Amino acid sequence: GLDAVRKRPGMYIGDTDDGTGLHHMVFEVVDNAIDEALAGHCKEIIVTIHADNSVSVQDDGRGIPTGIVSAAEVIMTVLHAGGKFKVSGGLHGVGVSVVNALSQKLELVIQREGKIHRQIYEHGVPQAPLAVTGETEKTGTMVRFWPSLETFTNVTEFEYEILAKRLRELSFLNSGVSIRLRDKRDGKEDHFHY
Numbered sequence: 001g002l003d004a005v006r007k008r009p010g011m012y013i014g015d016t017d018d019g020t021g022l023h024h025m026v027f028e029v030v031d032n033a034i035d036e037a038l039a040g041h042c043k044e045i046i047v048t049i050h051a052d053n054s055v056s057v058q059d060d061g062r063g064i065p066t067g068i069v070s071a072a073e074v075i076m077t078v079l080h081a082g083g084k085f086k087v088s089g090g091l092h093g094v095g096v097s098v099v100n101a102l103s104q105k106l107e108l109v110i111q112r113e114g115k116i117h118r119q120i121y122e123h124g125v126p127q128a129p130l131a132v133t134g135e136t137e138k139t140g141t142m143v144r145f146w147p148s149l150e151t152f153t154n155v156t157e158f159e160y161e162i163l164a165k166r167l168r169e170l171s172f173l174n175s176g177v178s179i180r181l182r183d184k185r186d187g188k189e190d191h192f193h194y
């Protein structure tokens, strides 16, 4: 359950004190975007550091399934869910659900099939069912997660360089995947595309 991971966070995400786990959180969201890219659907991934020390990742793939509790929610709220959807990003067997369970807030926005969907979680818990919130022609998935300050302790702020270097590496391992980093705190931006 998501409680298993709040109980023993380090074991799932890395060391929650020294900043390792807190940065690892980003790469267990990006992991799925790189996979969407690798399956041929996702062309670009925008990773963003927000003034409030949240990190959003936006892809332009198919958009996590919305059908039904919804598919999306299953993925977000069940540890094993990810296996129902040989390359890169994250640690084998860890999906976005670990990220959600360790985030005080996570906002999910899916653009799929002419419609925008939004949903918010607190500490893993959905605030409402996934819901339609307008029309769009774009497709993609967007996760914005605010790390729990109940889990991550000393290093609590995302460090642009740690992110930059690993995103560049990931885009190099996966030729053609366009990864962009943006930092809204200072305007700093990079594009990684081999």
Ligand SMILES: O=C(Nc1nc(-n2ccnc2)c2nc(-c3cccnc3)sc2n1)C1CC1
Pocket (backbone or CB within 6 Å): 029, 030, 032, 033, 036, 057, 058, 059, 061, 062, 063, 064, 065, 075, 082, 085, 095, 096, 141, 142, 143
């Ligand atoms: O999670 C992301 N994208 C994503 N992730 C998926 N996923 C799969 C397992 N955990 C996350 C995912 N699955 C997709 C899918 C799966 C089956 C049919 N159609 C679409 S699109 C997609 N898109 C982006 C924000 C980082």
Ligand SMILES: [Mg+2]
Pocket (backbone or CB within 6 Å): 028, 031, 089, 090, 091, 092, 093, 094, 095
């Ligand atoms: Mg993973």
